[model samples]
Target chain A: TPDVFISYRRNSGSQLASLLKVHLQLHGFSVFIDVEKLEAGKFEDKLIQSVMGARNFVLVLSPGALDKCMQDHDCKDWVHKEIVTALSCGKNIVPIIDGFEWPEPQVLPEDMQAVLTFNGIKWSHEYQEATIEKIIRFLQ
Target chain B: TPDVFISYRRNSGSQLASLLKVHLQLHGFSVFIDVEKLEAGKFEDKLIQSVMGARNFVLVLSPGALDKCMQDHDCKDWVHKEIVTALSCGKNIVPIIDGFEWPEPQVLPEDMQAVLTFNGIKWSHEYQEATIEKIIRFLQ
Candidate 1:
């Protein structure tokens, strides 16, 4: 099982996802990045399998992602589903709030409520050292 | 007063604008650009004033700029008002289209009919050189 399974929309979060994947891997976290995992139409089953197997979830939040969440009709965002599943399984859940403003807790769905309540690790190199330290401590 | 004023959404056209500005400046054209003209918040007013002062208008069209065009509503599109003003004053009009898809000429205002009729210079290094040559010729 991978250390972290990142969930993000491709357009806005691809660069951020790649950066985080590189950093986390350098710190020895096994990453499951769909971009690297899939080529064209391949890995439809592998992606689902990997997410189900991952022990941790890293949600890369962006403004565009907020739009996706607001429009989600299933009472849970596609990304938040990973968070909920991970939490339900007693796996580590880390919210990596990127450049987007944190939404009001009430705005989030029930599955996301728990993730939002946790003071998330914001994505920035300024806090990298402290954040990595915290992450390592949590992993151990 | 300058002959042509180039207005573009920075995040969308920053590199392309810089390249155009470099070549146009080398050819001794007095081109007004946000990079050289405005300081952040001052950008809107300075842009309008430049629009009023300029005779020719070169619009860099892209999907990212669609929202900005709709919000301002000075005319049909962001480029519409300038094109109309230039047309009324018998000023030269040069339209340069750049993006994944070409814009339909039918959407352009009546004043820009002639401009819309001409094949737009597709964005490429070859197109950039050809555009500069065409603009310089028109100015002379």
Candidate 2:
């Protein structure tokens, strides 16, 4: 079981996700990042399994991250599925905002609106050390 | 008249704003920043004067900028007022997102919803040169 499960779109947020994974691991937390942990082929079951057992669910809200989900058909995007399951299971959800604002509740699908209510942390390369420190503190 | 009016909240965005002002100046664009150009007192009239004459309105939307505007009662905030005036005057507006997402249009005051319509650019320490280059191109 992982201590944290990170969900992020590849195009815009992959760099931040990979960076966060390394920092979290350095802090002694077992983190599951799809690109680094999963095999090349599709593994929805394994992805779901990782999210199910994780203590914290971290959604990286980079520019276009939410839009990608909105564009996907219902129950099709892996990020959306992971978030839905994370919410239903009452996992600790942390939306790490990077160069994007939290979407207004009205703009989100009904199932994902709760994400807007969670207090989130913002991260940028300018403030990486402090930002990562805050995340570690939140995790602890 | 200045080529760009750099608007930013002092607490969160001043450093980046100052850096950008210097860079823009070095590139031969006349930049107006309140802290560098204004007297240290409340100078709403002076601020409006600067925004009115500028060729472009560059809003530095760092973390807490929108929140600061929202917390102000009525049109009491200078930033909010400046943005409103800039819109009415039909000045070119560029939102420079720093460590934050563009606030959702629904969450913004009705008058400020147009800010969402303007394409925004994001900046960070890792990509400062590239980000500024894009902004310079937009300004030109």
Candidate 3:
């Protein structure tokens, strides 16, 4: 029932995804974040339904958020699946970068590699409020 | 071999598509538009490869551009497939609207309805140069 879906890795992006949910809710924007969703095929299928319902997909790429895919290359990890679902549905994808850098394109699966081309709002612990405001402005 | 692919209907969007190709060429960007492609399945298969090569998908939505699909609703017309391909690849889609307004979502199939969510620059016969300039700025 949310208009915005947050895509983030539990290891590196969980905290920011949690923070964003609360802030966006305060601004009257419904947000989707499944912090307690069941952990393989079930996860991808269930969350894609969530992704389909949302108009926006906010991707949290905090440090090491994509490290698993970087190491394995071409794997459909949950993060990668979330991105693919968002793109397949034409959701407005916005990356929220918190000290993260994209790996080489060769390391990414063909479907998810488009993540690099998207521009994002930079987030820093010291400037959290300002970054959220910028994100909110764009979402509105 | 072009980075910008223009998607438009032969009936309503062909002129603007041609105009855009010429202006974008003058601006130093290679553009892809097939004014002479063989017209059914061959058409869809052929152009999708063009869609894949391009980083930017410029959809010319001149008046009546989507009327055919509005009446049929779920047909895989050329415009709808081009949109689905662009969205699947996360292509930077900029709808170049010229006096075209979207019909209600009920008339659009689920996969292609996301076209309505993208905001675009208004183009008019009275402001051709200015419109091309605005399009060029975004392509940059």
Candidate 4:
């Protein structure tokens, strides 16, 4: 079982997810990313199981990520569902904003509004290393 | 053959779609809405065919609809793909935003940025009739 589950949208955060995956592994933290961890099974069931078992859920939020979640209804995206599951399971929720400000709570769906209250880390080209360090520290 | 293809996420816009179907039919215009028109066909192929055949594409842009498209990878959401198909075929794209502001072009994927350029109509409890009239005028 991994210590952390990484949730991200492919277009906006796949590369960042790959970088985080490597860094987390190097730091001796077991990480669960869908592409790396999920080989086969019912997509939703397996993801829910992983989220239920994980201690932390790291959301890599890009402008696109926020847009996707806001547009999804009843949290249709697998990533959205994963976050919802993680929240309900009482896992530590860490949001890492990529090159954009976090959206206000009013813009988020009612069930997900709690994400706005969680402290988040920010990453841009200039702040990548620093943000990663903070993430490592948070997880440690 | 329908003049308008009504694209909507079922959770957010099904009622609005049903309303549009009735109103458009009453106005002597043929409208193709998935629930009424689609029957036991390969989902993607038939939807693509419907979009291709339609003269105009009416996208119901609820917050949930936007969230789904942004999170979808490679335009995976059927509605997103329908918009993509409509763009490729040069169909008139009419966006109806329900209770939210239009998303900025920068927030959309490269291929879908054109949605920002299309003038959108807004629909809320107060503006339903006026908005529907605007949509009909645009389609005509």
Winner by lDDT: 2
**Model 2 spans > 4 angstroms off:** A40-42, A71-73, B1-140
Q: Which stretches of candidate 4 lie over 4 Å from their true place?
A: B1-140
Error of 2 at B123 (Å): 22
The docking category that best describes candidate 2 is: incorrect
- For A1-140, candidate 4 gives per-residue lDDT tens digits of 89988988866566466567766776789999876687687877888999998898898886668776786767886776887787788889988876656678787777777777778887644344466689988883
TM-score of chain B of 3: 0.87
Which 10-residue window in model 4 chain B sums to the lowest lDDT? B123-132
Each prediction's total of clashing residue pairs, residues at least 3 apart in sequence or on different chains, is: 0, 2, 0, 8
Best model number under TM-score: 2
Clashing residue pairs for model 4? A68-B67, A68-B71, A71-B64, A71-B66, A71-B67, A71-B68, A72-B67, A72-B68
User: What's the TM-score of every candidate structure?
Assistant: 0.45, 0.49, 0.46, 0.48
Question: What are the per-residue Cα lDDT tens digits for candidate 3 across A39-81?
Answer: 3467657787888888988999887887776544555577877
CA lDDT of A52 in candidate 1?
76
What are the per-residue Cα lDDT tens digits for candidate 1 across B45-122?
665667778775666665444443333434745455555555566555555556534446454444554545543555
Query: Considering just chain B, what TM-score does every model have?
Result: 0.65, 0.90, 0.87, 0.89
DockQ-based class of model 1: incorrect
Top-down lDDT ranking: 2, 4, 3, 1
Cα error of candidate 3 at position B132, Å: 54
DockQ of each: 0.03, 0.03, 0.01, 0.01
Report the C-alpha lDDT of model 4 over B62-108, residue by residue, as the tens digit: 66576667756678777778878888899999888766566666666
What TM-score would candidate 4 get against the native?
Answer: 0.48
Give native contacts recovered, as a fraction, per prediction: 0.00, 0.00, 0.00, 0.00
- Tens-place lDDT digits, model 2, residues A58-135: 889887788866755577877888888899889889889877865666766778767777779987544556888899
Error of 2 at B76 (Å): 40
